[PDB]
């Protein structure tokens, strides 16, 4: 039945991504005094189906003519890693329970950059290669803070096991303990997912389409699905890490509802941010991380090391 | 006479410094912009349900040209060619011959809707209120040739839209 | 075997989609459509590496907090963090952090 569980994790996540697209469109429209897609189906519920079918039936252009193996691997790697990163998350029981699921997710996120790295290069264009390079720098720059902030907050968890986060936050959300870290981590998620105001990679206003400028029809759809799946997964990781939920062992449905609602709130926050702010300049993006954030994260890491010792609140290892 | 944008000096008192440090660290202005967007989210959208809902227009609207007739049914245009002269894009081609009844009528009246600029001239020049840009705006065509109107097409448009055109002229004829 | 199964299933699903998106829509009949500067700012990438090394060195800290010699552990942890901060400060002050 384990394969059944794998499918139950995979297909609903893809459907959620498809409808997250519609949700984004409608929310952005309403914050711009507009109405989202509503002609295609009741209240626009059938729009993602139309979008997908239109994309698939569309011409498969491919002037890459260089390392087509890479030009095909990049979408595969992106989608596969986006689906895999969902596996260790405890909602409330994880599909795969790892002692170090957190470091596993960090490694998978680091790997997922290779999808953008290769796609842009195998495209063998101008915007594609330079845009891919800007991507590497962006994700790489925020990966540092992501790890430090994650280590700082888990110092209270006592392990890298995602499941124990529920136990640690049983009485209070960890945001109350580490809100500065929470803010920096949220911005870090935004940067890692390449979302506005850090949507420099794609960067349509500046780069025609970025790394996916030479990707069309299905491969572009897979990149879109990977992007949105990463958005939902990172927001779910935020919800588990900071906005903990009550878990009744006999009725997991309550925790599942609470967790889903919090992740939806965070994704809506992502769309809200995309609507509000303009895009940070490539240079300003790095200035905000290495020169502004990296320091405060180091100080807070020292503090979160020191606090359990000086407050005798060292969490149990098991 | 002149006003200085910017040109303001921040206070250096500890309270003001603390406030600005809070703004930088706690992202207050970003939160204000976020709240503005949230309020706009909860405001009613301005979209009209086209085609079921149509945008407002005034009686002086300038759309598809339409040759009109007298109440008797005789075509108003009297081959003055004044419209062709004022036409700023030379989209009007007029040919006339004395008709069998002996009246001065147009054998050819072509308005190239692909060269016309919808200036509103001719409508204000025709001494007999013949060519009058109708209220219709949704007359897109699938081929270029359909937009090269003929006198028959113009007269058919006038017959089709006369009910609205007469009312609009009645509304606006006093302002002219 | 569970983790191996998950990896296999995900990879196969993604590759299956890539197949149905690279070859299946490629059948549809059509016609003919015809169709770097040396980045010295790569220093940022290199600095990421040496900082990622400290990242790795710092990961054992949650289990390091479980020792009985908490004094020595705390001193060494703050030593590593202060050395990282010193490295960042040095690169900052020497204009080495010339991003873009």
């Amino acid at each position: 039945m384990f394969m059944i569980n794998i499918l139950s994790l995979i297909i609903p996540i893809l459907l959620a991504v498809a409808f997250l697209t519609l949700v984004e469109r409608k929310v952005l429209g309403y914050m711009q005094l507009r109405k989202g897609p509503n002609v295609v189906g009741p209240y626009g519920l059938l729009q993602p189906i139309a979008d997908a079918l239109k994309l698939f039936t569309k011409e498969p252009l491919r002037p890459a003519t260089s390392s087509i193996s890479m030009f095909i691997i990049a979408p595969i790697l992106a989608l596969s890693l986006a689906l895999t990163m969902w596996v260790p998350l405890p909602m409330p029981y994880p599909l795969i329970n790892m002692n170090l699921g957190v470091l596993f997710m960090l490694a998978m996120s680091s790997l997922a950059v290779y999808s953008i790295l290769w796609s842009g290069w195998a495209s063998n264009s101008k915007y594609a290669l330079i845009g891919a390079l800007r991507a590497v720098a962006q994700t790489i720059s925020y990966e540092v803070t992501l790890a430090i902030i994650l280590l700082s907050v888990l110092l209270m968890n006592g392990s890298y096991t995602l499941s124990t986060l529920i136990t640690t936050q049983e009485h209070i959300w960890m945001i109350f303990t580490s809100w500065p870290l929470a803010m920096m981590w949220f911005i870090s998620t935004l940067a890692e997912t390449n979302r506005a105001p850090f949507d420099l990679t794609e960067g349509e206003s500046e780069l025609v389409s970025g790394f996916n400028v030479e990707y069309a029809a299905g491969p572009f759809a897979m990149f879109f699905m990977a992007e949105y799946a990463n958005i939902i997964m990172m927001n779910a990781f935020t919800a588990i890490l900071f906005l903990g939920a009550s878990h009744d062992p006999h009725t997991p449905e309550l925790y599942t509802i609470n967790f889903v609602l919090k992740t939806l709130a965070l994704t809506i926050t992502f769309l809200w941010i995309r609507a509000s702010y303009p895009r940070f300049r490539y240079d300003q993006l790095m200035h905000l991380l290495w020169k502004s954030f990296l320091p405060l994260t180091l100080a807070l890491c020292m503090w979160h090391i020191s606090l359990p010792i000086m407050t005798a609140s060292i969490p149990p290892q098991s | 006479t002149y006003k200085f944008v910017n040109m303001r000096e921040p206070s250096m008192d500890m309270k003001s410094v603390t406030d600005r440090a809070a703004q930088t660290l706690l992202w207050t202005e970003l939160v204000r912009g976020l709240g503005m967007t949230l309020s706009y989210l909860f405001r009613e959208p301005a979209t009209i349900n086209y085609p079921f809902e149509k945008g407002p227009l005034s009686p002086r609207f300038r759309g598809e040209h339409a040759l009109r007739r007298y109440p008797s049914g005789e075509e108003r245009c009297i081959a003055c060619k004044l419209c062709e002269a004022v036409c700023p894009a030379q989209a009007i081609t007029i040919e006339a011959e004395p008709r069998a009844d002996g009246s001065r009528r147009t054998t050819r009246y072509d308005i190239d809707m692909t060269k016309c600029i919808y200036c509103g001239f001719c409508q204000e020049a025709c001494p007999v209120d013949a060519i009058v840009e109708g209220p219709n705006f949704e007359f897109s065509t699938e081929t270029h040739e359909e937009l090269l109107y003929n006198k028959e097409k113009l007269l058919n448009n006038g017959d089709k839209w006369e009910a609205e055109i007469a009312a609009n002229i009645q509304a606006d004829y006093l302002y002219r | 075997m569970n983790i191996m199964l998950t990896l296999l299933t995900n990879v196969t699903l993604a590759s299956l989609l890539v197949l149905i998106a690279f070859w299946l829509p490629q059948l549809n009949a059509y016609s003919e459509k015809t169709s770097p500067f040396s980045m010295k700012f790569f220093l940022v990438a290199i600095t990421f590496l040496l900082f990622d090394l400290e990242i790795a060195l710092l990961l054992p800290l949650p289990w390091a907090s479980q020792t009985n010699n908490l004094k020595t552990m705390l001193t060494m942890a703050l030593f590593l963090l202060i050395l990282l901060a010193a490295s960042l400060a040095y690169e900052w002050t020497q204009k080495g952090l010339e991003w873009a």
Partner: peptide, 26 residues
């Protein structure tokens, strides 16, 4: 005296560094 001036300038121009150094010192 001059230390207070340095602290005021630092908080006005580089508040993040001031916060980081304070937290690390504590």
């Amino acid at each position: 005296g001059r230390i207070a001036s340095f602290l005021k300038n630092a908080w006005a121009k580089e508040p993040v560094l001031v916060a980081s150094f304070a937290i690390g010192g504590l």
